[PDB]
Amino acid sequence: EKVELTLDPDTANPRLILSLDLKGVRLGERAQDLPNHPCRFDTNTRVLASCGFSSGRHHWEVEVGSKDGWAFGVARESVRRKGLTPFTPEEGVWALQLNGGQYWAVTSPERSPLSCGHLSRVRVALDLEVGAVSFYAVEDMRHLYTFRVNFQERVFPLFSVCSTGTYLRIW
């Protein structure tokens, strides 16, 4: 079922720029002086939605920038917030990424280069019963990639922007 997400400003890395409607995120030039919430990503340029899921099937849609430097998908609640944490499934993050002009599923120890054409808006489908996170290009709902995961805890929508000049935006 459809979920209306808002970004959680307590989690946001201080270099990120969130939109006032808490749907949009970009990377800024300099770090804002933000109160040090324990949930805040102090180093990785990440932000979670406020909503986490422990059961059921849920979907949302993400508008993506055409320029390099984003990743999104889901993170387990216990993802490390403090220090430079590897962006890997073992560290509790399951994401797609645009980097070096190439779409990737962020697998380890090697990322997986995807076949897809240019992406504009992507549906993310989280199933905690089946144990799946799936991505679709919204135009014709074409499957891009599925991670099979045995989720053991609450899972949050995850967004990351690591370059100026691109963005992610919840639809």
CATH number at residue 40: 2.60.120.920
Task: Tell me whether residue 60 is in a domain.
Answer: yes
Q: Which residue has the tokens 């992406």?
A: 119
Task: Tell me whether residue 7 is in a domain.
Answer: no
- Resolved by: X-ray
**How many whole angstroms separate alpha carbon 75 and alpha carbon 95?**
8
Task: For residue 91, give both structure tokens.
Answer: 């560290």
**How many whole angstroms separate alpha carbon 80 and alpha carbon 77?**
9
Given a contact cutoff of 8 angstroms between Cβ atoms, the answer to whether 121 and 57 are in contact is: no
**How many whole angstroms separate alpha carbon 91 and alpha carbon 117?**
28
Cα-flanking dihedrals φ and ψ of residue 47, to 5°?
-155, 140
Task: Tell me whether residue 137 is in a domain.
Answer: yes
Q: Is 29 left (phi over 0), alpha (psi -120 to 50) or beta?
A: alpha
116 secondary structure, DSSP code: -
Task: Tell me whether residue 9 is in a domain.
Answer: no
Cα-flanking dihedrals φ and ψ of residue 10, to 5°?
-65, -25
2 secondary structure, DSSP code: B
In which domain, by residue range, is 114 found?
16-170
Task: Tell me whether residue 113 is in a domain.
Answer: yes
**How many whole angstroms separate alpha carbon 147 and alpha carbon 150?**
10
1 secondary structure, DSSP code: -
What is the b/e burial string over 87-117, where b = at least 16 CB atoms within 10 angstroms of the residue's CB?
bebeebbbbbbbeeeebbbbeeeebeebeee
Task: For residue 115, give both structure tokens.
Answer: 């076949």
The reported resolution of this PDB entry, expressed in Å, is 1.6
